[PDB]
Structure 1
Amino acid sequence: ENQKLIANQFNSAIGKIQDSLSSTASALGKLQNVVNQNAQALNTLVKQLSSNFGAISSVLNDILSRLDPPEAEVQIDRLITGRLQSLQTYVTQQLIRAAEIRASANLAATKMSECVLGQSKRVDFCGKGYHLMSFPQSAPHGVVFLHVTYVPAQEKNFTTAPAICHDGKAHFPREGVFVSNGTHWFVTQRNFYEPQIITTDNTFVSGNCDVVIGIVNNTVYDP
């Protein structure tokens, strides 16, 4: 009934995507900081080539030219121990960061299997709200999803009751609680008001009336 409006909201959000990319420098914060983390990881890896690490200098050729090999060997020994420790630190940090990246990669694979290749039922997994679908849009050293979700906006206060006793038999709703607009009572799902005429098709009898808390008397249409 509102497919054109759905398209309108979809295209409006897509239009807002360009604004989010352009006006905001933190819209791609995660991917930007991941590329960064890598960038200064390699950068500091470079700078430890300049760090003395307790040696006389950071130039092996300078050390060898300055002093005799009996002590130069010890100098490059200390320098190279420092460089190896720096590389070990970088590789361990890389392993932990890649473990985080692997967790995010399995998370993205799960979101694509359940959410692109399906419709994920895990709340707050494919965005804030009832999720619809996703679109992978690759960015370097990462991926971008467009979580089309469903979010109710406008509410209205109604009256409820779990059961209905027309001929002394209780009547509970199959899906969607009982609601009333003030005069007549209706059935509607949780996430979108759409009334139904209370009939036996949407209700099932279970037990008597006095056992149900909150039940109200009501009239059931006879098809």
Structure 2
Amino acid sequence: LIANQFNSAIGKIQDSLSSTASALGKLQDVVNQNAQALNTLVKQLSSNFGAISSVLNDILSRLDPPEAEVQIDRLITGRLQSLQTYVTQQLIRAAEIRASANLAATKMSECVLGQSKRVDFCGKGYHLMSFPQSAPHGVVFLHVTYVPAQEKNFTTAPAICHDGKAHFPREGVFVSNGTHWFVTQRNFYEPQIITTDNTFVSGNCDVVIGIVNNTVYDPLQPELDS
């Protein structure tokens, strides 16, 4: 069942990626930004910045140095300012990308190379594992997680009373469907008979709140009288 679910999920991934492209926005966006930052830059060559022309050779072919100097000063100021703007924006964007990359590396370490107990760091659910896949200027993690699906109501109790003493579960919780009590692991309904192997004793029943009554089966006694 687990294998089938996993394979079906992978198929769904194929379908999702084939159908819509928007999924990779995070990447595409980046590209676009840079493209703009370049186009803009290039466009800023076509401007005059108060000069008689946006071309340099035209000025050189029309004016003598005494005045071409002034016009060229205007153009240089404009273009240098444009370059500074571009470089500043690029620095900031690079900081942003470096943050993203550091996050990605942390994920490849804590998530792929291991099994993280950090919540929602490695997908919605209880992290089982993750698989990386490259992509243009980025990476893509497929996070395999365990998601509880079918849930049932049960009466519960933090402890029970057997002989005035209080028994708590070692690994799990006490439950009741209405008639009988069991102990089971919390993440999956696997009911078991309540014993001294499933529980430990501490104090008595005049302290605990919400405590209840039931019989704890001792595996040893039948073995003796047998």
The answer to whether TM tops 0.5 is: yes
CA drift of 1:122 comes to 1.0
Of 44-53 and 113-122, more deviation after overlay is shown by 44-53
Q: CA deviation at 1:191?
A: 2.3
Indicate the larger mover: 143-152 or 87-96.
87-96
Q: Distance in 1 between matches of 2:66 and 2:136?
A: 49
State TM-score, norm by structure 1: 0.89
Find the aligned partners of 1:54 and 1:32 in 2 and give their Cα distance: 37
Percent identity over the alignment is 100
CA offsets, 1:134-172, max 9 Å, x none?
Answer: 111110110011011111121111111111111111112
> Equivalents in 2 of 1:144, 1:79: separation in Å?
45
Per-residue deviation, 1:63? 2.5
TM-score using structure 2 length: 0.88
Aligned match of 1:154: 150
User: For the Cα contact (< 8 Å) 1:111–1:120, is it kept in 2?
Assistant: no
Q: Distance in 2 between matches of 1:177 and 1:58?
A: 79
Give CA deviations for 1:90-122 in whole Å, capped at 9, x if unaligned: 222222222221111111111111110001111
Residues 115 and 58 of structure 1: CA distance in aligned 2, closer, same or farther (over 3 Å): same
> Which structure shows the bigger proportion of residues in strand conformation?
2
2:38 & 2:195 partners in 1: Cα distance? 69
In the other structure, the counterpart of 1:75 is 71
C-alpha displacement at 1:180, in angstroms? 1.9
User: Structure 1's 79 and 203: CA in aligned 2 closer, same or farther, altered over 3 A?
Assistant: farther
Change in Cα spacing, 1:193 to 1:57, as seen in structure 2 (3 Å) is farther
Give ranges in structure 2 of 5+ residues lacking alignment. 219-226
Cα 1:148–1:69 change in 2 (3 A) is same
> Structure 1's 64 and 135: CA in aligned 2 closer, same or farther, altered over 3 A?
same
**Bigger radius of gyration, 1 or 2?**
2
Task: Write the mapping of 1:22-37 to structure 2, written as runs, cut at 5 A.
Answer: 22-37=18-33
Structure 1 residues 116 and 70 mapped into 2: Cα distance closer, same or farther (>3 Å)?
same
- Measured after TM superposition, the shift of residue 125 of structure 1 is 0.6
Alignment partner of 2:134: what SS?
strand
CA offset digits 1:179-201 (Å, max 9, x no partner): 22222222223322221222222
Paired residues, number: 218
1:65 Cα deviation after fit: 2.1
Residue 168 of structure 1 corresponds to 164
With over 3 angstroms needed to count, the CA separation of the structure-2 counterparts of 1:206 and 1:33, relative to structure 1, is same
Deviation at 1:219, TM superposition (A): 1.4
Unaligned runs of 5+ in 1: none
Q: 1:23 to 1:168 in 2, by over 3 A?
A: same
- Counterpart-to-counterpart distance in 1, 2:119 and 2:196: 33
Displaced runs of 4+ in structure 1, greater than 6 A? none
What is the distance in 2 between the residues matched to 1:181 and 1:91?
A: 68
